[PDB]
Each structure stands twice: as C-alpha cells, then as structure tokens.
C-alpha cells in the first residue's frame, strides 16, 4: 500500500541512488557494474534487509540492545553499526552542502557553469558546441572543480578553508538540529508532496536525457558489459558496497525497530516492495545519468569513459548540463537542487535520529535524566560539524573521497554483514530464527531467506574480501590521482574503527566472564531471555 511507501521509503531513497550509484557505475565501466550489482542484490540485499527488520522488531530497540538477546558474545555489532552511522553522518551532509551552494549560485539570470567568461575559469576552456567546430576543458566540469570545490593539487596541500561552503554546512546543520530537537517529521499532509516531487523531477530529467542526441551510445555503455572487467575485485566490492549502502544494511536495525513496528502488516511483502522500489529508482536514474554522459561524449568528440570525473562529482557535472540544456535553465536548476536537498535531508534526519536514540540508549541514566536531550543533540551536531569542516577545504575533496570509500563503505560493510549472518544462521541457530519469525509474523522465512543467510551472504562476503586482498590495487581519485601511503593508512584506520568493534568487544566480554575459558564461551554464546 502507498501508506507504507510514504512512511518508510523516504528514509531509504536518498542521495545514494541518484548520486552514489551513477558514479560507481561510471567508475567501473558501466555495464560490468550491473551483473555483480544484481547478484549481490538477489543474494543478500533483500534477505539481509528482511533480517534487519526482524532483528529490530524482535526487541523493539536498536542495535544497542537487540544483540544482548541473541548472542552476548557478538554484541560489538551494535557498536560497529553506531560508529558506522557516526562516520556516515559526517560526510553525507557534505553533499547537501554542495547542493545548497549550487542552489545559492543558481539565483542568477544566467547559470555560472553555462559559459566560461568568468574570472575563475582557465584559458583552456572551450564551449562544448564550439569544441568540435587540443586539451580543452568544458566549463561545466572546471566550474565544479574551481568555484564550488577549489580543488587542491593534492591531499598533502589542504589549503585554505572555504567560507561559503562552511556557511552552507552551517545552514544545513542548523536545519538538521532544529528538526531533530523540535521533533519535526514528515507526518503532516506535506509528506505527499515531499515524496512525490523527487520522482517527478527525476522523470523530467530522464525525459530530457533520452531526447538528447547521441544518448544511444550512453545507454549502450550503461548496459553492454565487459566480462574481463568483472575480474577486477574493485567492481565486485563497489557493487556489494552499493547494495549494502542503498538498503542501509548494518544500519537499518536502529530505525526499523520503531518505523517497522506496525502490527498486522506483511513484513516480507513490505521489504520486497521497498527492495523493488529502491533498485528501480537507482537503475532508472542510471539511464538519466548515462544519457547525459553520452550526449556530452557526442558533443565533445571524446570517448564516453573520459567525458566526466570518475568520482563523487559525476552528478554535479552531468545534471547541471541537463538543466542548462532546458528552457529557462535557472528554474530547472533551482527545482533540481531543492529536490536533491529534500532527498538528502530526510535520510540525514533519519540517520541522526537513529544515532541519537542509540547513543542515549548507551547512557539512559545521564542523557535521559532531563533537559540533557537537547544538549546531547547540540553537542552531536557540533562535533559532526567540526569533523566535516575538514572536507570543505581546498583539499577537502580527497578527504571526502577517502571517507566515502572507507568510513561507511568497502570491507567494513562486508565484515559486519558476514558476521551478522554467520551469527544468526549458525550460533543463534537458523532453526531458532525461523521459529522466532514464525511467532512474530505468522509464517517461516522459507528456503530462499534461510539459505541466503546460511551460505549465500557469507560466501559472497568472504569471496569478495579474499579477492580484494589477493588482487589489491591502491585507491585512486579520478582516473590519475594516486593517494599517498599516509592517506591510505588513514582510510584503513577509518575502516578499522568499525572493523575492530567486534573482536575488541568479544575479548572484553570474554575477560568479563568468570570461570574457565570454555565456561566463558558457553555462557556468552547462549542467548538471554
């Protein structure tokens, strides 16, 4: 029913589908990204998502408490999820800051990125139409690189702190703090408009994308695969990470406990509908992105894979071109950027609310004692602001890319999902989990979910991990910039901040149990009442 969609899909459908998926697909060569994407989807995404929903509904609480009633030994999964959300909230709002900056720069009679007569623009610029009348540069890309971003030559040169981006971040975080502290949510009649406007904007942008000349090459690049490319563990990691990130895998359990607590509802069918909708909107926005990419390739006379940045700025490079090739470009640009802000703000609100609830669940005696509820939210928003302030500098793009790749992505999500599935399937028991689901919703999961939890997800996780550490390649920004060893170490430290949460809590709880070691393992493995 549409009620479930308007109630739930707002927190899942966000920037990950319209922005993260297109650039991951473009980075991996287009069509080769889709096969592992769908394999990971139908192997783990929906099953693990339903597992998170069941875990949340079983205890009526987030990851801070539900794991104590399943397996006390592996209680570190909740802390890992909490730190994953903490790292995600720092860098997810940088996209909203960029969108706000673009929206503010859109209040002009002519879009700044439509032409390159301005002062920030390099002499190498040449108009796209006149480029195919050398090493010329399109105004749309170099605008994004120099005005909005002011890209430093490397991460070793942080440069100055951009004040305009800092104030945009301040505005977005003030909105977030006000909404969280005032309990503002999309419960009013405006929820219909808030949900329906992004899809209408995406449909308009897609319609614009198809009618551009040369879009057929873009669709061909999007859909035609390259087997040899799949042999690159990078594409497998990207597909699995995108599947886990778009569906909030290892993050859903803290919010589904309250959101998905409605009784008499079909949890299985609701999860299936959400999975269909999210994958559909992602795959649909892929066509819109790749049609614009193909049109740019045909206009500039260059290969499709070389037209734009193979990084987070693919959306901010492609979509402004589309709104510039529409009648009254300012109006369409403004609409698109309010749409992007609305998609990001709801997901950010859901994530911040989940983080706050989990953290106050780690300390109810102090934070819930009174007026501390607002002070904790203010402190969280201030600390996240100070952490994100590193990413608005001239070299902030490299830090943003590192955080995107490692902090809430990569091997950490595979690690957490593999441990969750392994625990639930083998240590807690698949036969007991099926009985619990039978008691909760009335019917057992069946064979697909059971086998996916038992074998399919762990096998995929360990296979991707082994293929990554056997064919490892360094992380790179764009197609040429190689990261320094210290940046790679920082990214690995960000990943390990969540990766080590399981073994450390395991050893801490093992040292907290009296008696022999075997007695300690027996006590910690047995679920609590």
């Amino acid at each position, epitope marked *: 029913k549409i009620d479930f969609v308007l109630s739930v899909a707002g927190g899942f459908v966000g920037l990950g589908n319209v922005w993260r998926f297109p650039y991951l697909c473009y980075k991996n060569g287009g069509g080769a990204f889709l096969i592992p994407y769908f394999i990971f989807l139908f192997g783990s995404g929906l099953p693990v998502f339903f597992l998170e929903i069941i875990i949340g509904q079983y205890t009526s609480e987030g990851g801070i408490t539900c794991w104590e009633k399943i397996c006390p030994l592996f209680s570190g999964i909740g802390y890992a999820s909490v730190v994953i959300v903490s790292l995600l909230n720092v860098y997810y709002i940088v996209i909203l800051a960029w969108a706000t900056y673009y929206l503010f720069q859109s209040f002009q009679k002519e879009l700044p990125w439509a032409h390159c007569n301005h002062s920030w623009n390099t002499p190498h610029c040449m108009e796209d139409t006149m480029r195919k009348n050398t090493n010329f540069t399109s105004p749309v890309i170099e605008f994004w690189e120099r005005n909005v971003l002011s890209l430093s030559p490397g991460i070793d040169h942080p440069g100055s702190l951009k004040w305009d981006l800092a104030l945009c971040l301040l505005l977005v975080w003030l909105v977030c703090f006000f909404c969280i502290w005032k309990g503002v949510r999309s419960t009013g009649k405006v929820v219909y408009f808030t949900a329906t406007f992004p899809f209408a904007m995406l449909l308009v942008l897609l319609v614009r994308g198809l009618t551009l000349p040369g879009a057929g090459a873009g669709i061909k690049f999007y859909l035609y695969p390259d087997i040899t490319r799949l042999e690159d563990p990078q594409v497998w990691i990207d597909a699995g990470t995108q599947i886990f990130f778009s569906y909030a895998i290892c993050l859903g359990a803290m919010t589904s406990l309250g959101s998905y607590n409605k009784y*008499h509802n079909n949890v299985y069918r609701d999860c299936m509908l959400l999975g269909c909708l999210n994958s559909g909107t992602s795959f649909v926005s892929g066509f819109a992105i790749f049609s614009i990419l193909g049109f740019m390739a045909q206009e500039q006379g260059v290969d499709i894979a070389d037209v734009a940045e193979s990084g987070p700025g693919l959306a901010f490079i492609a979509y402004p071109k589309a709104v510039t090739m529409m009648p009254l470009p300012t109006f369409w640009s403004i609409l698109f950027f309010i749409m992007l802000l609305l998609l990001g703000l709801d997901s950010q609100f859901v994530e911040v609310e989940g983080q706050i609830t989990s953290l106050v669940d780690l300390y109810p005696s102090f934070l819930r004692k009174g007026y501390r509820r607002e002070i904790f939210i203010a402190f969280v928003c201030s600390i996240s602001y100070l952490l994100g302030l590193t990413m608005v500098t001239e070299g902030g793009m490299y830090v943003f890319q590192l955080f995107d790749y490692y902090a809430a992505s990569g091997v950490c999500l595979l690690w957490v999902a593999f441990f969750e599935c392994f625990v639930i399937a083998w240590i807690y028991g698949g*036969n*007991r989990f*099926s*009985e619990d689901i*039978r*008691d909760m919703i*009335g*019917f*057992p999961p069946g064979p697909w979910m059971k086998y996916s939890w038992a074998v399919i997800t762990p096998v995929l996780c360990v296979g991707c991990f082994i293929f990554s550490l056997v064919k490892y390649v360094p992380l790179t920004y764009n197609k040429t910039y190689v990261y320094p060893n210290w940046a790679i170490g920082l990214g690995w430290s960000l990943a390990l901040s969540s990766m080590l949460c399981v073994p450390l809590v395991i050893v801490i709880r093992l040292c907290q149990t009296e008696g022999p070691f075997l007695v300690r393992v027996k006590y910690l493995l047995t679920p609590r009442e």
Partner: antibody, heavy 118, light 107 residues
Framework: EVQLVESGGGLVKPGGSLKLSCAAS????????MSWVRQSPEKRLEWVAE????????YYSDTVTGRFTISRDNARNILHLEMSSLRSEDTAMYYC????????????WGQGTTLTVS | ENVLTQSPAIMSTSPGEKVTMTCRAS???????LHWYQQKSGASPKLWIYSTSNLASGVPARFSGSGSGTSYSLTISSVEAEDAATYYC?????????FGSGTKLEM
C-alpha cells in the same frame, strides 16, 4: 506430509490424569508446528494448545491453561499431550493438527482418539 | 477470546442450487488469518479455504470464499450430494484460537 495417527485414548475417572500421543510420518516433524483441536460430543470444535516447531513457544486455551501440558519428541516424531486434572467438561474427541503457517491454517488432521470421563 | 459464531446452524438445501453461509466474529480479524474447514459426518475435519480466498488442494473451484472485517462467508456454486458436511470458521489472528459453531448441510 501423509500420515497423522493419534493414540492413548481411554476411560478414566474425573479429576484423573491421562497422556495422549500423536504420531507423524512422511514430513519433517521438527520443522512443523503442531496444535491440538478438541471436538466436544456436541460436535463443537475447541482449541486446546499449540506448540512451536522447536517447542520454545507454547500457548494454551483459557479453559485448559492451568491443567494441561503439551510436549513433542522430534527424535521419534511423536506429539504428546499430558493433562493433570480432567474436569467433567473435558470429555471429547482429541485431534492433532499441523499448524506451521498461521496464514494457511491446519493443513492435516489425524484420525483422532476419544476420551471418556465418568 | 474472540468468539466466532455462524448464524445458519442448519441449512436445508435442494441439490444443484447455490448455498451461501456466513461467519461472524466478536472482533475484527485479518483477511489472511481466517480459514474454513470441512468435516464429513463421522470423519475428521479437513482444510477447505484459507486466507479467505485461496481454495485448498482437495477442493475444486466449485467452492469460494469472501469477506473482510468482522464478517466473512463462503459460497457454493451448485451443491451436490458429496457436498453435505459440516463447515467451521476459525481465526488465526491471535491466541486463544477459536472455532465457529459450525454449519451443517441438512440435505
């Protein structure tokens, strides 16, 4: 999913104790929930108790919650129903039914056994 | 306990005609949490209709079911001699489980 057979019915005095049996074959008894359905001599159906596939979750009717107890034997695929105190209204014919799916109901029913109190 | 009651306890019928019998519940039950069972005279009951629409494997399309909220019913396109039996409505929405008073075709 072929056979269900009950056993253990007999004649007892009021207030006594008796244990019923329900044998199963042709399907995985350890993965299917089992419930007992009671048919009064007036032909009225009444639910008694339900036991989960693993036996951890167990429910009883309000009329027999304090006197009845249900157990299962996954190794022998035998379902047991033990009662401590049979009242005058406890005389009926007992059926064991497979109730693994709540949205589907009792798929299979056994032959049943009569219990008489006097 | 949600007491379920069926009004037409006795239904005299003519062979080949259509017969519809209804079940009522004291509280609203889900559409997927009510089922019907057929019990032959002197035989054990058997599942007949589940989820209020899905016919069982052992029953042809001749039988049908419909209903929602607190009211539910089943329909027979044309009753034959083999259709003479007792039918019970049962709920699975919440414990304790309850069965209807039953409706027996008298012809």
């Amino acid at each position: 999913e072929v056979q269900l057979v009950e056993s253990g019915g007999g004649l007892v005095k009021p207030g006594g104790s008796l244990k019923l049996s329900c044998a199963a074959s042709g399907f995985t008894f350890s993965s299917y929930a089992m419930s007992w359905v009671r048919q009064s001599p007036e032909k009225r159906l009444e639910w008694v108790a339900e036991i989960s596939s693993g036996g951890r979750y167990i429910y009883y009717s309000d009329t027999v919650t304090g006197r009845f107890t249900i157990s299962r034997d996954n190794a022998r695929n035998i379902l047991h129903l033990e009662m401590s105190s049979l009242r005058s209204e406890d005389t009926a014919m007992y059926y064991c039914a497979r109730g693994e799916v709540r949205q589907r109901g009792f798929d299979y029913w056994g032959q049943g056994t009569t219990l008489t109190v006097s | 306990e949600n007491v379920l009651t069926q009004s037409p306890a006795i239904m005299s019928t003519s062979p080949g005609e259509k017969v519809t019998m209804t079940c009522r519940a004291s509280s609203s039950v889900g559409s997927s949490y009510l089922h019907w069972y057929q019990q032959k005279s002197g035989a054990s009951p058997k599942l007949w209709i589940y989820s209020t629409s899905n016919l069982a494997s052992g029953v042809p399309a001749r039988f049908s079911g419909s209903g929602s909220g607190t009211s539910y019913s089943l329909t027979i396109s044309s009753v034959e001699a083999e259709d003479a039996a007792t039918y019970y409505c049962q709920q699975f929405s919440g414990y304790p489980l309850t069965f209807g008073s039953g409706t027996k075709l008298e012809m």
